[PDB]
Amino acid sequence: IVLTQSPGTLSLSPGERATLSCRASQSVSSSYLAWYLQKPGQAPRLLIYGASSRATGIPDRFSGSGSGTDFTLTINRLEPEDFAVYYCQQYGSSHTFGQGTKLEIKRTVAAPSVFIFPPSDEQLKSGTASVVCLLNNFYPREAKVQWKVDNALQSGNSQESVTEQDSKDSTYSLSSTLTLSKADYEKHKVYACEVTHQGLSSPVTKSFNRGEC
Amino acid sequence: ITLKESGPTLVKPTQTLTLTCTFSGFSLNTSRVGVGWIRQPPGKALEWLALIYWNDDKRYSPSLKSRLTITKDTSNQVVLTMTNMDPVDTATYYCAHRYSSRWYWYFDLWGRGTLVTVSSASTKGPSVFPLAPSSKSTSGGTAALGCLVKDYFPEPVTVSWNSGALTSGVHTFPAVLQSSGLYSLSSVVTVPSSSLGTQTYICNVNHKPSNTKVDKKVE
Amino acid sequence: VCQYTIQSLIHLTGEDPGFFNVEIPEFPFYPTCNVCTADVNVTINFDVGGKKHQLDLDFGQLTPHTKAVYQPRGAFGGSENATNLFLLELLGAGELALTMRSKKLPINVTTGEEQQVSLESVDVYFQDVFGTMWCHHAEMQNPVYLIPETVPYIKWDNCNSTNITAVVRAQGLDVTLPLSLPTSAQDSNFSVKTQMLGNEIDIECIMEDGEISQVLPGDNKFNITCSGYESHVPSGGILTSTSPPGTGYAYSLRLTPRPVSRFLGNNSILYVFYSGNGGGDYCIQSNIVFSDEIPASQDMPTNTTDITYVGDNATYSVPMVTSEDANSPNVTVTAFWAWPNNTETDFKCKWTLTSGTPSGCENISGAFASNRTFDITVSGLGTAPKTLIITRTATNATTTTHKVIFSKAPE
Ligand SMILES: *[C@@H]1O[C@H](CO)[C@@H](O[C@@H]2O[C@H](CO)[C@@H](O)[C@H](O)[C@H]2NC(C)=O)[C@H](O)[C@H]1NC(C)=O
Ligand SMILES: *[C@@H]1O[C@H](CO)[C@@H](O)[C@H](O)[C@H]1NC(C)=O
Missing domain, CATH: 2.60.40.10 (Immunoglobulins)
Structure with missing residues (x-):
């Protein structure tokens, strides 16, 4: 049995x-x-x-x-x-x-295609803001994302999700979501997403400045 | 041959659970065919639940015979029933088909299954928000755009892009539970950088348990 | 209750051809004992829609030296002419088999329960010549629902009819047929299938190990499976290449499937489908005939031995059984002289751990020792050689029987 x-x-x-x-x-x-x-x-x-x-x-x-x-x-x-x-x-x-x-x-190693999406205007009307960082396509599952704000490193609040490997392309994808109140969002300007990976020589970091379009 | 599941995808603790399997391509009043249900709590293994035969005998999982009944309604319907629910029962539930009458036996065909959430909570629907393909989202001659779906309790959420016209390059992330008790997620896709706004990109989000269904554009 | 019990697991394979079949090798059948009057009950447990129900059967005396297949003397809880739904057949080497028709209802149940009848387990109770109650238990590890129906006879009348009649004996068919092929001197993706029909029964058999694409000159052995309750002795088949008009190229084929029982009837027919470069496309049939032969090997296989010492004080260090439980929960040893005369008297030589030598049965004696080997002692030996029969068993042992010739001293 x-x-x-x-x-x-x-x-x-x-x-x-x-x-x-x-x-x-x-x-x-x-x-x-x-x-x-x-x-x-x-x-x-x-x-x-x-x-x-x-x-x-x-x-x-x-x-x-x-x-x-x-x-x-x-x-x-x-x-x-x-x-x-x-x-x-x-x-x-x-x-x-x-x-x-x-x-x-076991796909031939490929690098994570990093993106970042700021919280949208309609989302801000609620009093909260969710900053999303994206690793689009890559093989090695062992990827890490660290969230920095004004070069200050956050903890805990950052949530992460991973898509299942694509059958045709063997491509992984990851979503790292950082959620904080609208008030806490206004306290700082530079929002950055630091990525550490086997497929990256040294960790990458892609960022944006609040309000700059 | 095909089978379909049907039932409430959310049930309160200690309440009763009722799931209906509708099928076509075979008749059970005729002989040799048997129908049963299997479940998989996400991540965990499959667990067999119940089975019913053309001769109307019914055999259940030994440890769950205390809480289960499976019945027959129409020429093409089978109804499962489960009582004294606990949130650990939260799982995806399937109904399947067998062509033999050799008592214990394999399963030949499977329905696509339906999820059952078990927790005391309101049936809150989602709130959709876009994720702009801003200047910062440019790379490799391409850009990416997506829709955030947030603050919905009952887990089943479905998403499609350009009213189902677009399939390739789309990613639908698994949902995560927020500290607020509501799940959230986001679905994304990539486009050539030339295609900036040449076609209005639409994410069609459907949340049937709340009946909430939203179509959203993004710059 | 039972003095010795044997468990066994029943192995269905494929659809039920129309009867259940069980093989019981462990029961004893002494050599040279033609007065071996064994008595048997049979019990079957049926699960009908979740209701545990039983069916006891009586088979009475056995005369292995004279009769082979036995219809039940009676039954409890059966349907019309229920006893005529069963058979118990001897097979030789101490083996026997049990058969039940499954296309008809054994027991009575109310309307609606007929479709739900299923078999869970079977017990065979066996009173020995020495009175010991042996028992067998067979468990349907996976039960089967019975389907009553009067299935028709089917004749593939368009099939070539060779005249080598298939003789079924000891439940084990063995027939060799010639073949004429359009050359195919080398592989032509040969595949074979066989079907046997008569009296509601349909036995269909298939190749194991795939299909033939690896021919060799000479003999070519291949495994087969038959839809039924496969015997512990496997089914098989062997092809032979050719011999030393119209480019006809000769071949010959041998087969032996043995979940085969007499319920087919003396009228049944065998069908053999084979194929070259074509489930079988080239056909041959052959009429089935069942032998009324009495199995001439029912005597349990004997550890044949010869012994000799002085006078009449002869002994024999009787070893343990094959695969003995060394701690030996309960044990039994019994013996008698060859070709006995009187049932009551010549069959009183029994021993156990607790029970010393009881009444009756002179000329013999013995006991166990710290050696744990049973040193037997006998007396009253005549002026000429005599043969002795001995049997031993312990719990969860496999029965052992010894044939000991007490050859008198030489010149
Ligand atoms: C086989 O079953 C029958 C019936 O249950 C048994 O026969 C009975 O035996 C007793 C003595 O022990 C007689 O007095 C009864 O008259 C018998 N019954 C009938 C209906 O005649 C028999 O002992 C069983 N044999 C075994 C080996 O179990
Ligand atoms: C078999 O016997 C029948 C008559 O019973 C006869 O017509 C037929 O030719 C025989 N076939 C062979 C192959 O011997």
């Missing part, structure tokens, strides 16, 4: 091969297991039965294996299309799923 999969968020270069283990505590009747695939923003797709039988439309490019306490899944000739979340499901007993494995393209 239990399943346990391989490490999470495996990152591989396309053209390589995938290797996902789905270990189990009790040996299912090995004829009875399935593999599934889901991409955030979509719904799960069916892949395999009994670890080898392939569903409709699926090519030879996929192969599972194993029995009892261990089932295994492999993907050949990896394509950027394939990089999503993967699960294994047991039948032959009470239905149970593995805790999930995720896939990432």
Whole structure:
């Protein structure tokens, strides 16, 4: 009644091969297991039965294996299309799923395209202001944003969000949001977004001056 | 073959939850087919909930048989029910299809699913605001523009650009919970720097649980 | 209740062809004992819409030396002519099998519950010749809902009919058929499929390991699967290349699927679909016939041994069982002389841990030791060789049987 999969968020270069283990505590009747695939923003797709039988439309490019306490899944000739979340499901007993494995393209390193958007006029009428800094497209997930105001470094208030990797382009994207009251926004002039990244020699910083258009 | 979910995407703690699955392409009064529901609390694993067969027998998750019922209404409707809710139940809920009658079995087809939020809160709608493609947003011969969506409780928010005409280059960020208890986000897209205002760029934001739907321009 | 219990897991594969089939190897069947009068109950547990319901069956005496397939003597809670829905067949080497028709309702239930009947587990109670109650438990790790229906007979009348009749014996078919192909001396993406039809039953079988695109001259072995309850002994098939008109190129093929039971009827027909460069496109059929043979190997496989010492004071250090639980929760050892005569008398030689030598059964004696090996002691040996039969078992052991020839001393 239990399943346990391989490490999470495996990152591989396309053209390589995938290797996902789905270990189990009790040996299912090995004829009875399935593999599934889901991409955030979509719904799960069916892949395999009994670890080898392939569903409709699926090519030879996929192969599972194993029995009892261990089932295994492999993907050949990896394509950027394939990089999503993967699960294994047991039948032959009470239905149970593995805790999930995720896939990432190991894209050739690319730099974050930095932007910054000031709080808009309508937003100011509310008495608050949200300053948004943007890292548009880049591979390496390990990106950091530090918010400086009049060269004074803020803390905590800056919120951050990350889009899931683009299937076609392998491009990440990040949103760093700094929220403060309109009153606190007027106290300072220079608003800057400092970016530290593997794809950047030394940290970048792009800024604007309040009111200057 | 297709399936659709339907139900209230927000339920109060300890209240009762009711979700309806509508389907086409098969008949369940005829044999061999079975329908069931699965859920995924965001990030966590899938958890099977309930299953119902053509022969009208019903089997549930052992630990949740105490709180669940699944039923049959029309020639093409299945209704799930769940009681004594707790906010940890907050999850995306699916209904799926099976072609066999081998008791415990895999799931062949899946609906796109519907989210259920579980928390005592008002059904506040969003407030949209633009993010200007100002001079500072210029780089590499291109510029970017986006719409902020802020201060809405019930999580489901959908966004489209130029009334669905534009798909490529768009990014719809995951929402974050603010200290105020309301979520916020922003959606962005990039354009050639030549295209400054040559076409009025519109972000179409729809928030059905509040019925709030806004179209917004930006310089 | 049970003196020795064996668990087992039932492995469905594919759609139910029309009957359940279970194999029970662990039960004992002594060699040379033609008066081996074993008695059997059978119990089945059905889950109908979530209601736990049972079905007990009686099979009475067994005469392995004389009869093979047994219809139930009676049943509890069955439908019309319920006993005629079951069979228990011997298979040899101490193995037996159980079969039940699944396209008809075994037990009575109210209107609406028919579609919801499912099997959870089965128990087989086995009274030994020595009276010991052996037991077996089989669990449907994944139950199945039964579907009553009077499925028709289907005839692929357009199929080439070779006359090598398929003889089903011991539930295990084995037939070899010739083939005439349009050359294809080398791979032509060969694929094969087989179907057996008669009396509501439909057994369809498929290739394992994919399809044939890797032919070799000579013999070519390949695995197969049949839609049913696969035996612990696998199904299989082997192709052979050719021999030493119209460019006809000769081939020959051998097969052996063995989840096959008599419910097909003496009238059933086999169908074989094969293919060159074309689920099978080239067809051959063959009439099915079921052998009334009595399995000539029901005697449990014997550790055949020969022993000799002076006078009549002969002994034998009887070893442990295969895969013994060393701490041995409960143990039993019993023996008798070859080709016994009287059921009541010749079958009183039993021992356990607590129970010393009981009444009856002279000429024999023994006990365990700190060696943990059972040093047996016998007497009254005649002027010529005699053979002794011995059986041992412990909890969660696999039964062991010894054939010991007490050969008299030489000249
Ligand atoms: C098989 O089942 C039958 C019926 O439950 C058992 O037969 C009974 O045995 C007793 C003695 O123990 C007789 O007095 C009864 O008359 C029998 N029943 C009938 C209806 O005649 C039998 O013992 C069972 N055998 C095993 C090995 O379990
Ligand atoms: C099989 O026997 C039938 C008659 O029963 C005959 O017509 C047919 O030619 C035979 N076929 C072969 C291949 O021997």
